Structure 1
Amino acid sequence: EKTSDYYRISEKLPVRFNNPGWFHGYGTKEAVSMYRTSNQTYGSRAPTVHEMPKVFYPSSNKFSRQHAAFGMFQSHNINVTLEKSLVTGPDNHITHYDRLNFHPSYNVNRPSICD
């Protein structure tokens, strides 16, 4: 009555298809009378352990809706930004403009901007 006993399994199958003994609402194999309508043959037998599917792979969508909930992201934000420099030095900071923005080293003879 245990599916994994008779066959191998994917080890993630729901306990429904691992335990087929819980399908109690199916036909009770009543003794057939002279008045046996053909239409009642539909779903008249409960499945056995062998009818259970080997593998199971649902189309899970939990993350989707919990992400697809509400609206979808859109930039009404203030377009704040800082233009960076063309140098990696945490001290020098020069861009396409303002190229004279750096630490001036220490000259000994000619003072600042001699020319």
Structure 2
Amino acid sequence: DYYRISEKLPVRFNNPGWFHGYGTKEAVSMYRTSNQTYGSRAPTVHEMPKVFYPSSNKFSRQHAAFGMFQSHNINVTLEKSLVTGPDNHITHYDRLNFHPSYNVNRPSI
């Protein structure tokens, strides 16, 4: 009814009625304890924040609980291609061209 709520804050901060259960101290008495001023009055709408954002930690809790990432693969050996063509992969330890050619004559290799 009052100020535009942040629409991420829970309805506990949209309705001050949900914090019932306190304010049950009686003034108007000679036996009034000074410490009763602490938590003396139930809140209203006006004393309740427009914006609430959390720091949600379920984004880290399960990774922390189930351990950090590690890898114990023995060897993924993946000697690669120095030429972009899918037909040929000539390696630095290899001095030989692949994809044998189509020559009319002199096929001495």
Q: TM-score, normalised by structure 2?
A: 0.90
| Number of positions where the alignment pairs a residue of Structure 1 with one of Structure 2 | 109
User: Sequence identity of aligned pairs in percent?
Assistant: 100
Separation in structure 2 between the aligned mates of residue 94 and residue 47 of structure 1, nearest angstrom: 77
Separation in structure 1 between the aligned mates of residue 64 and residue 32 of structure 2, nearest angstrom: 52
Structure 2 unmatched runs, 5+: none
Structure 1 unmatched runs, 5+: none
Once the 2 structures are TM-superposed, how far is the Cα of residue 112 of structure 1 from its aligned partner? 2.6
What are the Cα deviations for residues 71-103 of structure 1, in whole angstroms up to 9, with x where unaligned? 212222212221112011111110111131411
Once the 2 structures are TM-superposed, how far is the Cα of residue 29 of structure 1 from its aligned partner? 5.7
What are the Cα deviations for residues 40-66 of structure 1, in whole angstroms up to 9, with x where unaligned? 111010000011111111111112012
Choose the corresponding residue for 1:23, options 19, 42, 54.
19
Q: Where does structure 1 differ by over 4 angstroms across 4 or more consecutive aligned residues? A: none
Q: Cα RMSD over matched residues?
A: 1.5
Separation in structure 1 between the aligned mates of residue 16 and residue 6 of structure 2, nearest angstrom: 16
Q: TM-score, normalised by structure 1?
A: 0.85
C-alpha contact 2:8 2:53 (8 A) present in aligned 1: no
Separation in structure 2 between the aligned mates of residue 31 and residue 39 of structure 1, nearest angstrom: 12
Deviates more, 1:96-105 or 1:85-94: 96-105
Once the 2 structures are TM-superposed, how far is the Cα of residue 13 of structure 1 from its aligned partner? 0.8
C-alpha contact 2:88 2:98 (8 A) present in aligned 1: yes
